[PDB]
Amino acid sequence: GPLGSDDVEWVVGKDKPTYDEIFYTLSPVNGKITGANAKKEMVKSKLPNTVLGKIWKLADVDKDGLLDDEEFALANHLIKVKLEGHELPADLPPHLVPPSKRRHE
């Protein structure tokens, strides 16, 4: 088997339970929620429409219009991190890309 597997830790998974409880309260269907309820969270966090698009762009790598529990966790993280007073680089590093959506060349 592979022992020396280069698998970078997804820093979003550290506070995922929290975004999970927020994900399940927006009515998840088969592991995804509608962008309407995500939109709702986003606008509750008082982020400008420009920043809203920023977050979506960074959260949904494949752009399937729906947010998986993984994707919403990432989005939610960016959101609350903005509320923390942090800013976003607006670029997606490999340790932010979901394991099942990432490539490394």
Partner: peptide, 12 residues
């Protein structure tokens, strides 16, 4: 009718 472009935010 609700319709988006590249997300529910980036609608024109």
């Amino acid at each position: 009718f609700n319709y988006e472009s590249t997300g529910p935010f980036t609608a024109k």
